[PDB]
Amino acid sequence: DIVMTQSPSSLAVSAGEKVTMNCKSSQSLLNSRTRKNYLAWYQQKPGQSPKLLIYWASTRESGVPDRFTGSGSGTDFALTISSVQAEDLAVYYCKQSYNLRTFGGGTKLEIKRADAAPTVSIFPPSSEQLTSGGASVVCFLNNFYPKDINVKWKIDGNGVLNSWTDQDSKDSTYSMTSTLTLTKDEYERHNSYTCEASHKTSTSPIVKSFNRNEC
């Protein structure tokens, strides 16, 4: 029943900055026979399986940049990144292997970047979909920042599905898709279809649209 707790739950920092994060054990992880702390740090990038960085609380694993440092002994342990890079985006987990195994809740590391603008693409229902009774119009909000964003669905002047990508690993950006899902027959009934994209980079939405009758 060794319990692990991590703090803080999340961290946002711009490239170049230093960061620390902590990990607390309900009891000592120091082996009095190897004189080592059975405490390891793992980094898990979105889409990937956890990968080891440090073990024995201190010693780094091969290929792991030296900007990563594990430290502490006993019950309190820390991971320090001397200078965060864009690739450092990931959730960071500590793990005790002193008696059985336990992971702390993790620490999510987000990246602050130069406030960037989206890129909007509009897509009408595909032939195949209409001939299936349904019809969806899709909007692609690509490579912006931050995630603070909303989509207004104007039809001729509900049933919506949104989804944010996870932060990119080089341009530290975000993307989104609003899928206004519709019936064929009621898509057949109106003309102009627009997706107003409210961002905090402008007091006027991004303008992408099409007229059904023109397709």
Binding site: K51, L52, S97, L100, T102, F103, G134, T165, T179
Partner: protein, 215 residues
């Protein structure tokens, strides 16, 4: 080279049983502990238990959370590891990993599979419907609609297209998922040369190619 591959995961009905497999190669199997870890989507890693090595009698330990409900076994002739799960709950829906393990001293010998997705739900399995999304640079997309359970995988040109691709996190709705993928290429590439999204939904034994065409 050290290999681990999880399998046997998919949809199971609540209260059901399911046994996961983990095949290994590239190292003396009986010399290592073998561990099972899970992760509900967007949640944190939870250690589940392990089975020890030959010298330790292949003994087992478990997280308090699953002691008495999950059982860990190994077939030392097939170099295979197994996780038998009973009385499955919505909460057990997770990616399950096997990972090479050993005494805490040899933490650095950790090696993980890529996991397998177990969805516990009473919903009916449903194949995906794939639609093309046609419009100096240009953005194309593919709509993947009305399928269950996760996961599906989306590639463009069979993997040859990794740059400019935004595959979005699936979204549930009335027991059906919907995800989307956008790729952004130059104008000189499309529609001169084909752009094809390749959709794989294993749990419905589905593989669907969809070419993106103008007009």
């Amino acid at each position: 080279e050290v290999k681990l591959v999880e399998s046997g995961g998919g949809l199971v009905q609540p209260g059901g049983s399911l046994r996961l497999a983990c095949a290994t190669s590239g190292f003396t199997f009986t010399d290592y502990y073998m561990s099972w870890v899970r992760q509900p989507p967007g949640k944190a890693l939870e250690w589940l238990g392990f089975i020890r090595n030959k010298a330790k009698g292949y003994t087992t330990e478990y997280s308090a959370s699953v002691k008495g409900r999950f059982t860990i076994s190994r077939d030392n002739s097939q170099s295979s590891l197994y996780l038998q799960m009973n009385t499955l709950r919505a909460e057990d829906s997770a990616t399950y990993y096997c990972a090479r393990d050993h005494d805490g001293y040899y933490e650095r010998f950790a090696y993980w599979g890529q996991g397998t997705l177990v969805t516990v739900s009473a919903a009916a399995t449903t194949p995906p419907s794939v639609y093309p999304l046609a419009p100096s640079m240009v953005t194309l997309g593919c709509l993947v609609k009305g399928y269950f359970p996760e996961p599906v995988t989306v590639t463009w040109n069979s993997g040859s297209l990794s740059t400019g691709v935004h595959t979005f996190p699936a979204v549930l709705s009335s027991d059906l998922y919907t995800l989307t993928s956008s790729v952004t290429v130059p104008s000189k590439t499309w529609p001169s040369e084909t752009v094809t999204c390749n959709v794989a939904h294993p749990a419905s034994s589905t593989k669907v190619d969809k070419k993106i065409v103008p007009r």
